[PDB]
Amino acid sequence: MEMKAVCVLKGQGPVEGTIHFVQKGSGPVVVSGTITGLTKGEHGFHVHQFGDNTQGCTSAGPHFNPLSKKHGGPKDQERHVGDLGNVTAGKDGVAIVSIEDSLIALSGDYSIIGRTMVVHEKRDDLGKGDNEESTQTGNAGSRLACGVIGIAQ
Amino acid sequence: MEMKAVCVLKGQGPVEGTIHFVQKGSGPVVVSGTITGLTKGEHGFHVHQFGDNTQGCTSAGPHFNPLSKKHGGPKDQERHVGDLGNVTAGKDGVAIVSIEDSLIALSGDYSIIGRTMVVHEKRDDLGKGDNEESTQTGNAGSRLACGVIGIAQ
Numbered sequence: 331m332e333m334k335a336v337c338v339l340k341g342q343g344p345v346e347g348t349i350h351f352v353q354k355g356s357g358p359v360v361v362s363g364t365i366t367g368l369t370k371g372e373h374g375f376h377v378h379q380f381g382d383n384t385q386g387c388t389s390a391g392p393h394f395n396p397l398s399k400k401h402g403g404p405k406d407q408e409r410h411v412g413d414l415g416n417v418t419a420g421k422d423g424v425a426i427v428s429i430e431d432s433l434i435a436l437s438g439d440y441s442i443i444g445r446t447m448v449v450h451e452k453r454d455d456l457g458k459g460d461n462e463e464s465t466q467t468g469n470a471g472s473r474l475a476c477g478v479i480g481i482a483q
Numbered sequence: 484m485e486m487k488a489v490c491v492l493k494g495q496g497p498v499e500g501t502i503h504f505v506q507k508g509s510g511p512v513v514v515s516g517t518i519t520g521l522t523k524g525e526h527g528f529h530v531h532q533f534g535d536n537t538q539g540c541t542s543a544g545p546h547f548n549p550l551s552k553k554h555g556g557p558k559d560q561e562r563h564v565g566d567l568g569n570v571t572a573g574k575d576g577v578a579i580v581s582i583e584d585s586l587i588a589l590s591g592d593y594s595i596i597g598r599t600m601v602v603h604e605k606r607d608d609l610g611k612g613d614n615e616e617s618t619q620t621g622n623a624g625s626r627l628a629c630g631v632i633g634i635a636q
């Protein structure tokens with residue numbers, strides 16, 4: 331019934347964090363946790379396809395996209411399953427993560443278990459930037475920290 | 484039909500490694516990769532229940548054991564699903580991992596995706612030691628390095 335997961339974000343720089351996930355049956359996934367070391371403002375935050383840290387965050391591949399859609403914000407019909415929009419860091423570099431999402435899951439075809447969470451250098455423009463890169467990544471830029479999403483007690 | 488997984492092992496000390504997994508249909512899981520920084524000799528090697536690195540390797544919990552059995556070697560009827568026996572390092576501290584196992588899986592109820600691989604301080608006694616500890620851990624001792632098992636391309 332109740333499924334839990336966890337993700338420790340690490341990178342080459344100062345950004346680090348711990349993300350928690352909970353899903354009750356086929357309900358929304360509730361995403362919580364804290365990221366530190368960020369620049370003030372909005373940072374893209376997505377599930378990427380592969381739980382592969384062999385080349386740091388690069389080997390996580392693109393956004394998780396089992397329905398073969400273009401990039402959007404989490405409220406858009408046209409989005410990747412992994413598209414969880416932006417987290418916001420305050421003056422102190424701390425982002426408090428508080429997201430509910432209906433497309434990701436912790437079981438079945440939409441499961442993010444064994445995939446990667448990434449937090450980016452720049453704001454995700456939610457697919458509205460009017461260049462091709464917007465339709466793939468939201469122009470969120472480099473991957474500051476990432477972690478493989480694991481099963482939690 | 485074909486599933487691939489990967490696991491990057493890290494710890495507090497010098498031990499590191501990369502583990503690859505492949506499962507074609509309901510063939511066995513073929514486990515490969517390299518572990519470095521080990522003392523010469525045998526080191527226990529298991530799937531632990533939780534993909535939780537919030538407290539290093541400690542938070543991975545016990546050996547993955549959905550059938551509530553006693554610890555064993557991979558050839559024993561009585562084993563944990565996660566029991567993959569020992570890997571061996573020579574004088575260079577390098578273990579070349581080469582294992583085939585039919586109880587672990589990369590999908591379904593016995594999936595190890597999102598769980599943790601651990602490499603240990605000591606030899607796994609394969610549950611043959613005459614004490615309670617053998618029946619839980621194989622007397623494999625401390626957890627030198629671990630990582631969350633992720634979905635690979």
Ligand SMILES: [Cu+2]
Pocket residue numbers: 374375376377378393448449450470
């Ligand atoms: Cu991303």
Ligand SMILES: [Cu+2]
Pocket residue numbers: 527528529530531546601602603623
């Ligand atoms: Cu172990």
Ligand SMILES: [Zn+2]
Pocket residue numbers: 376393400401402409410412413466467468
């Ligand atoms: Zn996207």
Ligand SMILES: [Zn+2]
Pocket residue numbers: 529546553554555562563565566619620621
């Ligand atoms: Zn065991």
